[PDB]
Design a binder for this molecule. Structure first.
Ligand code: G65
Ligand code: G65
Lengths: 300, 300
């Protein structure tokens, strides 16, 4: 019993974190086989934060300009190249702790675990969702760039996020491990702001099903609605429209609890219109949207 | 920026988890040097859940009755003994991944990270607080017994919790690693229930300070109260009384934000009497009490 925000065990990723220093700039890098991946703005200079041209900056760099440390063991850089917004540093030693891994790009609504790192050293782990405006609401201080986000499948680490920057509203933006930013953001100091965000409806419903599995039942009712009439009220409260594929994904949860997905939609409709009236659901007083249906099935 | 529920990197503990099997009962054990620690009810039989005498059960056991697996590597048990409610199994191999560690017992209000394990295999990590009634609100399914809770200090793992059982209300009870239960619970199936719980006041205040550090300021006000008059309203809402030592611990946070602790108490008083009126604090619609002052300082 119980339902908690839960992250993946981080040991397989801890073994890959290193420190990358260029000049007087230090951030974290990810060491897999004989390549270190890190954000390219580690080569940025003070008088270049305006309109930096990273191709120019990198052509003016040599291998000895990059200092890489794995613990108290300096790694010798023997090649460098740029892969969109990430830098690839070829080193003379393959990481013996390299796990089976994949580079994957996630979608809005999907979750992953973040290993927050400072100076190549892991300090904490937490769970995050990619929002609809391609930001994440993380916890990141100065020096955290290069921290990575990941999912684990059996023994395989699917790397999906590298941290690059913080936006004015305090949310966070980054890239996949191929260097392609999530969302319309660039790695230079401009007036870029996040677009408007929406509530992830399929995740809220999954979370309601986790509530029922854990004995919270006060929000249920005898009403049932159509998918169409549910989406009408969803738009009014800035929720994502529900699709048939979203109903299918909720199938297993619906079967386990004996509660039809559209029955649970009818409950969510009433929660939006009347609120909670003081009561809580799984220890929360608002509707949580950062648990996928997979996260719920795994934990319950 | 940002404030998230955050756990410690779990790699140092992942390397210590093993599977302990006795008969047809399988739970998780903790392998440090040449000793495996696990809950003693792994020796329980079906016709003994009433009034089991564990001394009797263990005298009737031999070393070959305990099957210990570290991955796909069977560990040879060469000695056993009971340490209150935990079993100590001496094995013929010292764990080469054994970190620097301590056995410590925590207090109500203090937090720790839980590595949830099934069959000797870590599946997720989350943060927990010891409540005032010595339960934790964890996330634990059948087979999770022997999962451990821990804090990390630099390079040292302070083990503070081993999971033993789930109570009827769905909260969880366990022991320190010396086998002494937290709270008035025993490891046999009776009608034991958790006592009444209280809100951890010093943690709520720490969390309000984290809000201010993260730009949430709408709950502040120009009022200031005495410690005595604050405790009067705290008792009325089932909050723990605040002490001077609790004010001292909040010193650093008070200095960083320029907000006097008793000023923040005056804000908390108004939140209890009027509520939040729809607004949220750090993405929550209730007052969170599972962040210690240390947890806040570490993350902000
Ligand atoms: C997107 C981006 C673009 C360029 C930079 N780099 C700089 O601003 C910068 C880099 C290096 C220097 C120092 N110079 C270069 C070294 N040395 C020669 C001296 C001068 C001065 C400024 C950082 C970022 N990303 C950042 N993310 C954060 C951040 C803060 C808190 C939480 N999460 C992310 C701060 S900056
Ligand atoms: C406190 C306690 C006391 C005794 C036991 N053990 C049993 O009930 C039990 C143990 C073994 C058997 C099987 N027998 C022994 C082996 N074999 C000979 C066949 C018969 C049958 C029952 C478990 C516990 N603890 C438990 N915690 C949970 C639990 C569930 C979900 C989440 N967190 C904890 C279930 S049981």
């Amino acid at each position: 019993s119980g339902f908690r925000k839960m992250a993946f065990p981080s040991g397989k990723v801890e073994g890959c974190m290193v420190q990358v220093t260029c000049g007087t700039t230090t951030l974290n890098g990810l060491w897999l086989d004989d390549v270190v991946y890190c954000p390219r703005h580690v080569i940025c200079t003070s008088e270049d934060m305006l309109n930096p041209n990273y191709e120019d900056l990198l052509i003016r760099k040599s291998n000895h300009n990059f200092l890489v440390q794995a613990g108290n063991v300096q790694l010798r850089v023997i090649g460098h190249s740029m892969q969109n917004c990430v830098l690839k540093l070829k080193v003379d030693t393959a990481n013996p702790k390299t796990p089976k891994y994949k580079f994957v790009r996630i979608q809005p609504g999907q979750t992953f675990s973040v290993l927050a790192c400072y100076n190549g050293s892991p300090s904490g782990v937490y769970q995050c969702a990619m929002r609809h405006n391609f930001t994440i609401k993380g916890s990141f201080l100065n020096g955290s760039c290069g921290s990575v986000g990941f999912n684990i499948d059996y023994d395989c680490v699917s790397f999906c996020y590298m941290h690059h920057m913080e936006l004015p509203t305090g949310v966070h933006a980054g890239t996949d491990l191929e260097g392609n930013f999530y969302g319309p953001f660039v790695d230079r100091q401009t007036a870029q702001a996040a677009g408007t965000d929406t509530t992830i409806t399929v995740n809220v419903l999954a979370w309601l099903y986790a509530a029922v599995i854990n004995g919270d039942r006060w929000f249920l009712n005898r009403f049932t609605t159509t998918l169409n009439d549910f989406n009408l009220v969803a738009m009014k409260y800035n929720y994502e429209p529900l699709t048939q594929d979203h109903v299918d994904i909720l199938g297993p949860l619906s079967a386990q609890t004996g509660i039809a997905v559209l029955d649970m939609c009818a409950s969510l409709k009433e929660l939006l219109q009347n609120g909670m009236n003081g009561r809580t659901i799984l220890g929360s007083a608002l509707l949580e949207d950062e648990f996928t249906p997979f996260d719920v099935v795994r934990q319950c």
